Symmetry: C2
Subunit: 57 residues, 2 copies
């Protein structure tokens, strides 16, 4: 009985760990995309303010 319980727990542990690792990898990719979005936002903001100042002059 204990052997059966241990094997079932082992299988559940392995599958849940695999799914967690894959979702973690995708989360890392999402963070990379967020960083790129941050950079694009900052660059565009600088563009806009510079152009507005030049237009005023």
């Amino acid at each position: 009985e204990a052997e059966k319980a241990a094997d079932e727990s082992e299988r559940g542990m392995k599958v849940i760990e695999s799914r967690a690792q894959k979702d973690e990898e995708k989360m890392e990719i999402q963070e990379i995309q967020l960083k790129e979005a941050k950079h694009i936002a900052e660059d565009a903001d600088r563009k806009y303010e510079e152009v507005a100042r030049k237009l005023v002059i």
Copy 2:
């Protein structure tokens, strides 16, 4: 042997569940901030285009 295996399996399942929930939260917040940043980027690009045209005029 079975007792020790069961204890280790329980601890591993606990830690994997905690890490999985952490990953889900990170994925959610990453997606939210990503969408907000993309919308801000769209707004900035539109503003840049409009002010550039006015500047040429």
